[PDB]
Amino acid sequence: PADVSTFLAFPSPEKLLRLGPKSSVLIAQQTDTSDPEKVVSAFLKVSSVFKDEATVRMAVQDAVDALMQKAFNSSSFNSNTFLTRLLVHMGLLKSEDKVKAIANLYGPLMALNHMVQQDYFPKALAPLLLAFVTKPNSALESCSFARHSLLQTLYKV
Amino acid sequence: MSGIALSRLAQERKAWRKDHPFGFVAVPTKNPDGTMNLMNWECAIPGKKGTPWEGGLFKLRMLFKDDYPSSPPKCKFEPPLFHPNVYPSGTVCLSILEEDKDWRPAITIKQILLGIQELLNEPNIQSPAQAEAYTIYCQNRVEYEKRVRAQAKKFAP
């Protein structure tokens, strides 16, 4: 077996699957969704293990859904802050504080592709996400497939 | 150990008081004991005539660090403004306000305030500081200008 903390510390597809059949619930349960920064962190760590393979894709998508549903459904959760910090951590928007933008945006983009199609997703965030995913950026250009996919999906929101 | 910063700031205050652009305000705040706090200035920038910012008076605080002028002052609109290059915190971005960019001793308070005034109607769309204003500017210019005019009227003296 595995635990959520160990998974978040050193994310891997295998560790996610080892969390068990209820991994999605556990990731959400163990994340302090009252803090947008922590939600961005969990979202990116979970999405970092995305692989276009049945079991992993499902595990990542389910975890993203449980986490974001829990975060977004709180009337006190600032969805705009979440989006801003997500863009900052993805290296698409600058910030006043120093952050270590992730190296690979493939997983995050594929996770977002799934997220924006869910009922819990605040549609008001779609235009902002679209603006920053379409904006020129080397990291995004390296993940053309995932980028084009997410944009095509955003056009349908 | 801010003696060097204070020496320069005292001269900048005298220079500003002697001559500055009409409509602009830049005055040191006061310490509890009544003396001037040259490290914290309350300023105001008038919208440029002929632009959607006309009529508005935008207040900002200029904060100087102890190592000034090796470092540029931190400029923050109070309250924060709707503009692509102004962070939600109110901090405004300019190349001349970045130590690793164009900040140099030759830069004056007049140059900074005039630079920020110019930035108002001529944003740097390539380097946004907020997702909101950037998104609207790029997706609906007419709507963006409408929001700018409303904000200018809101802050009209």
Notes on the protein architecture:
Chain A: It comes from Homo sapiens. Chain A: Keywords: Acetylation, Centromere, Chromosome, Cytoplasm, Cytoskeleton, GTPase activation, Isopeptide bond, Kinetochore, Leucine-rich repeat, Nucleus, Phosphoprotein, Repeat, Ubl conjugation. Chain A: It is found in: Cytoplasm; Nucleus, Nucleoplasm; Nucleus envelope; Chromosome, Centromere, Kinetochore. The complex is a heterodimer of chains A (157) and B (157). Chain A contains ten helices and no strands. By secondary structure, chain A is an all-alpha fold. By secondary structure, chain B is of the alpha+beta class. Chain B has a single domain (1-157), classed as Ubiquitin Conjugating Enzyme, CATH 3.10.110. Chain B contains four helices and four strands. In chain B, strand 1 (25-30) and strand 2 form a beta hairpin. In chain B, helix 3 (131-139) packs across helix 4. Chain A binds chain B through residues 80, 83-84, 87, 93-94, 96, 127-128, 130-132, and chain B through 87-89, 91, 93, 127-132, 134-135, 138-139.
Topology, pairings included?
The complex is a heterodimer of chains A (157) and B (157).
Chain A: H1 4-9, H2 13-18, H3 23-29, H4 36-47, H5 54-72, H6 79-89, H7 106-115, H8 126-134, H9 138-141, H10 144-156
Chain B: H1 3-18, E1 25-30, E2 36-46, E3 57-63, E4 74-77, H2 109-121, H3 131-139, H4 141-154
Antiparallel strand pairs in B: 1-2, 2-3, 3-4
Helix pairs in contact in B: 3-4
Which features does this protein show?
heterodimer; A: 157 residues; Serine Threonine Protein Phosphatase 5, Tetratricopeptide repeat; B: 157 residues; alpha+beta; Ubiquitin Conjugating Enzyme; 4 helices; globular; ligase; ubiquitin
Number of helices of chain A: 10
Task: Please tally the helical runs of chain B, counting DSSP H or I stretches of 4 or more residues.
Answer: 4
CATH architecture of chain A: Alpha Horseshoe
User: Radius of gyration of chain B over alpha carbons?
Assistant: 16 Å
Site (Interaction with RANBP2) (chain B): 4, 25, 57
Keywords (chain B): Acetylation, ATP-binding, Cell cycle, Cell division, Chromosome partition, Cytoplasm, Host-virus interaction, Isopeptide bond, Mitosis, Nucleotide-binding, Nucleus, Phosphoprotein, Transferase, Ubl conjugation, Ubl conjugation pathway
Main location (chain B): nucleus
Family (chain B): Belongs to the ubiquitin-conjugating enzyme family.
